[PDB]
Design a protein around this ligand. Sequence first.
Ligand SMILES: NC(=O)C1=CN([C@@H]2O[C@H](COP(=O)(O)OP(=O)(O)OC[C@H]3O[C@@H](n4cnc5c(N)ncnc54)[C@H](O)[C@@H]3O)[C@@H](O)[C@H]2O)C=CC1
Ligand SMILES: Cc1cc2nc3c(=O)[nH]c(=O)nc-3n(C[C@H](O)[C@H](O)[C@H](O)COP(=O)(O)O)c2cc1C
Ligand code: SF4
Ligand code: SF4
Ligand code: SF4
Ligand code: FES
Ligand code: FES
Ligand SMILES: [Ca+2]
Ligand SMILES: [Mg+2]
Ligand SMILES: [Mg+2]
Ligand SMILES: [Mg+2]
Lengths: 238, 127, 437, 179
Amino acid sequence: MVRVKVNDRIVEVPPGTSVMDAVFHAGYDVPLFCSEKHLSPIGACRMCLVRIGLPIQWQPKLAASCVTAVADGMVVDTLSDVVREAQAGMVEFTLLNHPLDCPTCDKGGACELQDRTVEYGLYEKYELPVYTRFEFTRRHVDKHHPLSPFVILDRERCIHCKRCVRYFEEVPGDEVLDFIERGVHTFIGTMDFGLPSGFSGNITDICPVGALLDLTARFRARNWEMEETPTTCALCPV
Amino acid sequence: ASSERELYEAWVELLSWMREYAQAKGVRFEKEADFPDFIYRMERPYDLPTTIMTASLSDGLGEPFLLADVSPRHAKLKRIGLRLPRAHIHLHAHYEPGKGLVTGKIPLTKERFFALADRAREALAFA
Amino acid sequence: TGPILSGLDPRFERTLYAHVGKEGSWTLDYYLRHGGYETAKRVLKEKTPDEVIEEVKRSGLRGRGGAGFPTGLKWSFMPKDDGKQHYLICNADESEPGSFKDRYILEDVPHLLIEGMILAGYAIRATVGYIYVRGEYRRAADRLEQAIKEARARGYLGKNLFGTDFSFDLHVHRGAGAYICGEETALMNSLEGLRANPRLKPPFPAQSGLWGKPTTINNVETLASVVPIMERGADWFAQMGTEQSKGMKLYQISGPVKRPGVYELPMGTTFRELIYEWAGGPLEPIQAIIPGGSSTPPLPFTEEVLDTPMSYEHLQAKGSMLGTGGVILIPERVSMVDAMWNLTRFYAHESCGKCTPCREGVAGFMVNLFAKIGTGQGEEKDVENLEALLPLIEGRSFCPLADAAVWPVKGSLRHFKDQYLALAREKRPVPRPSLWR
Amino acid sequence: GFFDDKQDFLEETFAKYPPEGRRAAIMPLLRRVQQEEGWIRPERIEEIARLVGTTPTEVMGVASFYSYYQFVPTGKYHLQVCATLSCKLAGAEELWDYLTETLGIGPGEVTPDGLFSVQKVECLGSCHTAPVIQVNDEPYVECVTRARLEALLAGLRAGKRLEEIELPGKCGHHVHEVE
Ligand SMILES: NC(=O)C1=CN([C@@H]2O[C@H](COP(=O)(O)OP(=O)(O)OC[C@H]3O[C@@H](n4cnc5c(N)ncnc54)[C@H](O)[C@@H]3O)[C@@H](O)[C@H]2O)C=CC1
Ligand SMILES: Cc1cc2nc3c(=O)[nH]c(=O)nc-3n(C[C@H](O)[C@H](O)[C@H](O)COP(=O)(O)O)c2cc1C
Ligand code: SF4
Ligand code: SF4
Ligand code: SF4
Ligand code: FES
Ligand code: FES
Ligand SMILES: [Ca+2]
Ligand SMILES: [Mg+2]
Ligand SMILES: [Mg+2]
Ligand SMILES: [Mg+2]
């Protein structure tokens, strides 16, 4: 086992461990979009950056903690002004081309983006506070479009965390969703229409925002207004 | 200038063309989004000729073969925008004084528009 | 003379571009006559794989991909004998603005490439090698295919070359318009039939590359350079250059200059030599030059710069870098703001979409900052913003592309901040001089 | 069915890649469709998917990643103007305005005659001979000066094949001289 020191807290952990799960095992924490449980970890959203020392020799650039293996006697800084300043910049860049439908968005208060934004956004550099630096036309595109009788896609909302395409290839194995043009013009789309997989609904739970949404239950109530009942499905033997 | 006003005067007109074409070729026209600056204008004043910011020409399956937007009121570098979804073609129409709705230099007429949308319908339309 | 080769030396010998532009240079016959696959025959029978890696390493050759990484040490990374298929890849997708030196190797001396890749492939136990060219280089695509055809006809590519027990065959893969396919790792994905997003590069292409198998990737100029180095030894090669930049280099030059183009010089010759002696001097007053690629931070048109040795060290410690040798001079008649306004609306077009900081960050925020301030709509505030944007992107994108877009901007502020503030304060658009005839 | 016609092209291109790597074939196939038909129709993508042996979606996402592939009808000669710095310092902007103006067309549109289609492009790889224009996927038309450009136009408009149209002036190889 490898001896890692996250912030001030030191933690044991097996060799094949991410610096992310290292930092979450410790207690501390960090932004988090593209990365998901049981999905291949990548560094795409670039929010889980941390500072790393491997002495006290600190590395010159920030590391995406979700795709970095812990070395022995490693040091992880998640609090420094350097980190926070970045974190709040990654929030900023995400919301750059985001829609502005929060109240009228089925992604209620259950929305990873909403949440993280208020968790790490709006840096406190040390006069009126500046909420939004970006002041140009946003990314208008295809909106409120049903992929199936069960799913409804909102392209504007998508923040490109690679979760859904990534999930389709890996878990069920049905490549029925993938990105389209490149650059700032890219969106999610299908050419398999029906949304053919018998495991399509699961994207609904992974999506960090309200692009991919369970249409069986469009506009019923807000997320906190539900009376959640933890039980088991008795439709089959599993 | 007052060009800001005259821009929206044309944005409605473009919409009109779109609705015309939609019923004339019998294809789906869709309001894709209303201006946020209107839903959240509380008691504040508002005088733009309509409320639709994103409009589209979608097909049988509902997938867009034409997209249209216009920059919100309180936004910088204002232009109206024509985008043909899957074929990587973006367009930026501004408004010249005494000239009209132009794409850099070419007049974006009702004629020229219909050409684009027909071309786009035949090609891009899934069903 | 006495010591070291660095320019117009009477002792410098043209090697790569020697036959480019000579009538029918690309024929398998022209090649056989003026020299032939003689060097490769030799080495395949005499020197061993590990030996040929040494001679290349001793020479001090570094990736003319623009990276500058010891191609010797690079081959060193391949697994020795693991009973696994290995692949060699030629990166012949040359999409760096102001950088066009690989084009003509493919168009006019293709067999020079085939010869080098046979050498290299042998060094690493690769029996299969591919050539990702650009879908825009048409002639280069044809001549390279042509040559690979007639090389198989005479048995220079096939099951048992030169009677030795080594087999080498080549495959041309054309592109289809994407600067990002130039990146070694994404390049693979593109060819492989996926969307061309760079992969996780902590696992290098020597341990896992094309279809997972141990592969190695090199520039067209890198690979071509392998021939003269195996022909006339590492010492002939190291006889040219500086303390850390050995060999010759295909510097190219565009912009307003008497006679623009590709010029083979030793590594170390001066900007003053390229721009003047060969290129023939400027046609307008120049204000800055973009030294290597466009990914390179520009420098001012000063006497102290003109006397700098074009190297993986002299430009390094001048606040820039030697890219691909692609120089571009920029006139005073055009605004440095306008220059970058352009370059950046390029990196915007070419971004792949994978990262937030590059996608949204440069292709959204950054291109539009310029836009504003380049139409005389920008306040001093929009200059400050653009400024403080950089360090949020530069350090930590996914691949160096986003770096490539800010580095040049940063430099342009570091040397020309006055042109920006000036356009912002006077609410002035960028000057539009008449430039085309 | 576009490829039933030419199963010999398939044999030969699939054969450049390993059994476990048929998707590699995608690029080369799209490539063909384009040079044959001038653009990629949806059915063409559903076909290619079936050959390569993967889903439609996958292929279309890959297909739309690249600039060269057109997904709507394009003129007989689809002019691709270089736009970046070197060609800008050469006059690419003015070239583009003069072009778009004379023809009266921007991106998605095709001239009334069916023969001229326009598009901006990035650094084509010959900046010493700027400004640059690629016609379809034929070797470039370098040094497009106003004089030259009008020539190129009248030539194609007259019906001459591009490989052989007489252009005024002289254009260098890997080095170019100006006066
Ligand atoms: N010729 C052209 O058309 C273009 C050239 N470029 C150039 O690309 C350059 C940067 O390219 P990159 O490959 O991304 O730089 P890099 O930082 O990833 O280093 C590149 C090379 O070093 C090797 N390498 C580094 N550490 C290694 C290790 N621990 N083990 C094994 N191999 C290792 C890589 O395999 C690679 O060959 C720029 O300087 C730029 O000028 C950019 C665009 C176009
Ligand atoms: C964003 C990016 C784009 C690149 N584009 C090219 C390219 O177009 N051509 C090229 O030869 N190398 C390009 N490179 C560098 C490749 O990684 C390079 O070709 C490879 O490392 C060459 O091997 P060499 O250094 O031994 O020559 C690019 C690198 C990056 C990061
Ligand atoms: S996805 Fe999240 S941030 Fe975007 S509108 Fe919906 S709730 Fe708000
Ligand atoms: S639609 Fe949802 S899961 Fe798919 S990439 Fe976009 S944000 Fe991530
Ligand atoms: S930096 Fe830009 S081009 Fe590079 S991986 Fe990220 S988005 Fe793609
Ligand atoms: S969570 Fe690590 S980069 Fe997205
Ligand atoms: S800039 Fe036009 S070819 Fe390089
Ligand atoms: Ca729709
Ligand atoms: Mg709807
Ligand atoms: Mg001779
Ligand atoms: Mg392009």
